[PDB]
Design an enzyme around this catalytic site. Structure first.
Site, PDB file in Angstrom:
ATOM      1  CG  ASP A   1      -8.233  -0.883  -4.203  1.00 18.03           C
ATOM      2  OD1 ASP A   1      -7.026  -0.569  -4.261  1.00 18.03           O
ATOM      3  OD2 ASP A   1      -8.913  -0.928  -3.141  1.00 18.03           O
TER       4      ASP A   1
ATOM      5  CG  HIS B   1      -1.821   0.008  -4.380  1.00 15.57           C
ATOM      6  ND1 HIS B   1      -2.495  -0.971  -5.127  1.00 15.57           N
ATOM      7  CD2 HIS B   1      -2.760   0.606  -3.611  1.00 15.57           C
ATOM      8  CE1 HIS B   1      -3.780  -0.949  -4.780  1.00 15.57           C
ATOM      9  NE2 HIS B   1      -3.972   0.035  -3.882  1.00 15.57           N
TER      10      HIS B   1
ATOM     11  CG  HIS C   1      -6.537   4.226  -3.592  1.00 19.07           C
ATOM     12  ND1 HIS C   1      -5.497   4.078  -4.491  1.00 19.07           N
ATOM     13  CD2 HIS C   1      -6.493   3.150  -2.779  1.00 19.07           C
ATOM     14  CE1 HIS C   1      -4.852   2.958  -4.231  1.00 19.07           C
ATOM     15  NE2 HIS C   1      -5.444   2.369  -3.185  1.00 19.07           N
ATOM     16  CG  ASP C   2      -5.110   2.604  -0.496  1.00 15.09           C
ATOM     17  OD1 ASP C   2      -6.093   2.674   0.268  1.00 15.09           O
ATOM     18  OD2 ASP C   2      -4.930   1.685  -1.320  1.00 15.09           O
TER      19      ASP C   2
ATOM     20  CG  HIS D   1      -2.050  -1.113   1.017  1.00 12.88           C
ATOM     21  ND1 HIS D   1      -2.004  -2.332   1.682  1.00 12.88           N
ATOM     22  CD2 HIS D   1      -3.196  -1.130   0.299  1.00 12.88           C
ATOM     23  CE1 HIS D   1      -3.075  -3.045   1.377  1.00 12.88           C
ATOM     24  NE2 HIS D   1      -3.808  -2.350   0.520  1.00 12.88           N
TER      25      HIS D   1
HETATM   26  C1  LIG Z   1      -2.992  -9.934  -4.981  1.00 14.64           C
HETATM   27  O1  LIG Z   1      -3.958 -10.602  -4.146  1.00 14.64           O
HETATM   28  C2  LIG Z   1      -4.743  -9.808  -3.342  1.00 14.64           C
HETATM   29  C3  LIG Z   1      -5.027  -8.469  -3.619  1.00 14.64           C
HETATM   30  C4  LIG Z   1      -5.803  -7.723  -2.739  1.00 14.64           C
HETATM   31  C5  LIG Z   1      -6.314  -8.289  -1.572  1.00 14.64           C
HETATM   32  C6  LIG Z   1      -7.180  -7.556  -0.598  1.00 14.64           C
HETATM   33  N1  LIG Z   1      -7.781  -8.261   0.298  1.00 14.64           N
HETATM   34  N2  LIG Z   1      -8.735  -7.629   1.056  1.00 14.64           N
HETATM   35  C7  LIG Z   1      -9.794  -8.519   1.610  1.00 14.64           C
HETATM   36  C8  LIG Z   1      -9.226  -9.380   2.768  1.00 14.64           C
HETATM   37  C9  LIG Z   1      -9.364 -10.895   2.635  1.00 14.64           C
HETATM   38  C10 LIG Z   1     -10.762 -11.489   2.496  1.00 14.64           C
HETATM   39  C11 LIG Z   1     -11.904 -10.510   2.260  1.00 14.64           C
HETATM   40  C12 LIG Z   1     -11.891  -9.869   0.901  1.00 14.64           C
HETATM   41  C13 LIG Z   1     -10.524  -9.304   0.506  1.00 14.64           C
HETATM   42  C14 LIG Z   1      -8.719  -6.256   1.358  1.00 14.64           C
HETATM   43  O2  LIG Z   1      -9.545  -5.753   2.115  1.00 14.64           O
HETATM   44  C15 LIG Z   1      -7.608  -5.454   0.736  1.00 14.64           C
HETATM   45  C16 LIG Z   1      -7.860  -3.934   0.764  1.00 14.64           C
HETATM   46  C17 LIG Z   1      -8.553  -3.424  -0.461  1.00 14.64           C
HETATM   47  C18 LIG Z   1      -8.805  -4.152  -1.537  1.00 14.64           C
HETATM   48  C19 LIG Z   1      -8.432  -5.591  -1.679  1.00 14.64           C
HETATM   49  C20 LIG Z   1      -7.338  -6.033  -0.681  1.00 14.64           C
HETATM   50  C21 LIG Z   1      -6.027  -9.633  -1.286  1.00 14.64           C
HETATM   51  C22 LIG Z   1      -5.249 -10.401  -2.156  1.00 14.64           C
HETATM   52  C23 LIG Z   1      -4.953 -11.769  -1.812  1.00 14.64           C
HETATM   53  C24 LIG Z   1      -4.638 -12.875  -1.472  1.00 14.64           C
HETATM   54  C25 LIG Z   1      -4.150 -14.157  -1.075  1.00 14.64           C
HETATM   55  O3  LIG Z   1      -3.175 -14.663  -1.643  1.00 14.64           O
HETATM   56  N3  LIG Z   1      -4.855 -14.756  -0.086  1.00 14.64           N
HETATM   57  C26 LIG Z   1      -5.895 -14.059   0.673  1.00 14.64           C
HETATM   58  C27 LIG Z   1      -7.309 -14.356   0.310  1.00 14.64           C
HETATM   59  C28 LIG Z   1      -8.418 -13.590   0.351  1.00 14.64           C
HETATM   60  C29 LIG Z   1      -9.519 -14.412  -0.065  1.00 14.64           C
HETATM   61  C30 LIG Z   1      -8.998 -15.664  -0.299  1.00 14.64           C
HETATM   62  O4  LIG Z   1      -7.641 -15.643  -0.067  1.00 14.64           O
HETATM   63 MG   LIG Z   2      -7.602   1.136   0.559  1.00 13.63          MG
HETATM   64 ZN   LIG Z   3      -5.830   0.458  -2.764  1.00 18.50          ZN
END
Ligand SMILES: COc1ccc(C2=NN(C3CCCCCC3)C(=O)[C@@H]3CC=CC[C@H]23)cc1C#CC(=O)NCc1ccco1
Ligand SMILES: [Mg+2]
Ligand SMILES: [Zn+2]
Length: 333
Positions: A237, A88, A124-125, A84
């Site tokens: 995002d 990004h 955004h971040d 972040h």
């Molecule tokens: C490049 O991969 C990625 C990009 C991004 C995010 C983000 N996650 N989450 C949430 C937190 C986890 C579950 C709820 C939904 C996603 C965020 O809130 C972050 C902040 C803003 C946007 C997306 C971000 C996660 C990954 C991953 C991965 C991974 O390898 N295993 C984790 C995983 C998640 C589901 C299954 O497995």
């Molecule tokens: Mg954010």
């Molecule tokens: Zn972001």
């Protein structure tokens, strides 16, 4: 609070970017960073050239110098965290540009909404610390206490909006200073709505509200335009799984390191560490990326493309090809 200097701006203006097309869906930000020992200057130059190339700042009364001042005030408020960070938000800007102009999503929006989305990507971040909303609430941190006492559980997204408003309060870094009246009010309100919509706890409700407005556009065009802006910032995002496999993998490695550093800080504070944050389980990046693709990204991109963003079909095809690559990593272990 300090003004941007002439030396700061020249260091960005000298970057040339000879071999790169910043408008291409296969643009590689990792290679652009490696091609110079001043990658923070190269990242700023990519944002500056993309925005000026669009003609949008010129149309809305934003000078070349005020645009560059804005980009460098944003860069100052990003931290040296694994994911972040300023790279990004430059990546989300560049990616949104491809969705608008190679995916033809610009046909569904005004030129002012397109200018707002590219500017909003960069804010955004702001000031992210590599810790998510749940960390601040679970640990009773001061920012968690203020969120709780306030009403709003979007701890980070309200913080990012507050710093965006600070940067734009100085005319020398205000990319909206050339707007007045209703146009200026729409730029601020749409920017704030989009940042608040990036909290993944609102993911389901943002997606349902977009699909409902896409099925009946003429009965509420104001709502359709606002939800298309929210869904495009959200798409940018979570766009890492829509990229060429090696670009996709480098982002996945970087997010994983942040999740593990959060888990370690949660262990010191003796609070609950969810499995994907636990550095002690046998990591397994292919299983995490397949789970993210199956539960979040594949259904998101397929639904928005089927409902009306037909030009963005490449995102669905690339997600399928990346998932098949992660499957082969597991099948050959
Ligand atoms: C490049 O991969 C990625 C990009 C991004 C995010 C983000 N996650 N989450 C949430 C937190 C986890 C579950 C709820 C939904 C996603 C965020 O809130 C972050 C902040 C803003 C946007 C997306 C971000 C996660 C990954 C991953 C991965 C991974 O390898 N295993 C984790 C995983 C998640 C589901 C299954 O497995
Ligand atoms: Mg954010
Ligand atoms: Zn972001």
């Amino acid at each position: 609070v300090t003004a941007i200097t002439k030396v700061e701006r020249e260091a960005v203006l000298v970057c040339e970017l000879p071999s790169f097309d910043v408008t291409d869906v296969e643009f590689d930000l990792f290679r652009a960073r490696e091609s110079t020992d001043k990658p923070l200057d190269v990242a700023a130059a990519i944002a500056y050239r993309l925005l000026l190339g669009s003609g949008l700042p010129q149309k809305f009364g934003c000078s070349d110098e005020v645009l560059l001042n804005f980009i460098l005030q944003c860069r100052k408020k990003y931290r040296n965290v694994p994911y972040h960070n300023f790279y990004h938000v430059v990546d989300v800007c560049q990616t949104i540009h491809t969705f608008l102009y190679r995916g033809n999503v610009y046909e569904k929006l005004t030129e002012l909404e397109c200018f707002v989305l590219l500017i909003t990507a960069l804010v955004h971040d702001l000031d992210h610390m590599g810790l998510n909303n749940s960390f601040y609430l679970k640990t009773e941190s001061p920012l968690g206490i203020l969120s709780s006492a306030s009403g709003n559980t979007s701890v980070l997204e309200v913080h990012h909006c507050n710093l965006a408003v600070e940067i734009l309060s100085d005319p020398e870094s205000d990319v909206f200073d050339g707007l007045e009246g209703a146009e200026r009010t729409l730029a601020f309100r749409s920017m704030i709505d989009c940042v608040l919509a990036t909290d993944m706890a609102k993911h389901g409700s943002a997606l349902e509200a977009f699909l409902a407005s896409a099925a009946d556009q003429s009965s509420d065009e104001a709502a359709f335009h606002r939800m298309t802006m929210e869904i495009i910032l959200k798409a940018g995002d979570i766009s890492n799984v829509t990229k060429p496999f090696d670009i996709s993998r480098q982002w996945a490695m970087a997010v994983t390191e942040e999740f593990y550093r959060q888990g370690d800080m949660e262990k010191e504070r003796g609070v609950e560490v969810l499995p994907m944050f636990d550095r002690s389980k046998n990591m397994e990046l292919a299983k995490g990326q397949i789970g993210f693709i199956d539960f979040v990204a594949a259904p998101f991109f397929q639904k928005i493309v089927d409902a009306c963003l037909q030009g963005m079909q490449w995102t669905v095809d690339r997600i399928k090809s990346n998932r098949a690559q992660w499957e082969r990593v597991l099948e050959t272990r």
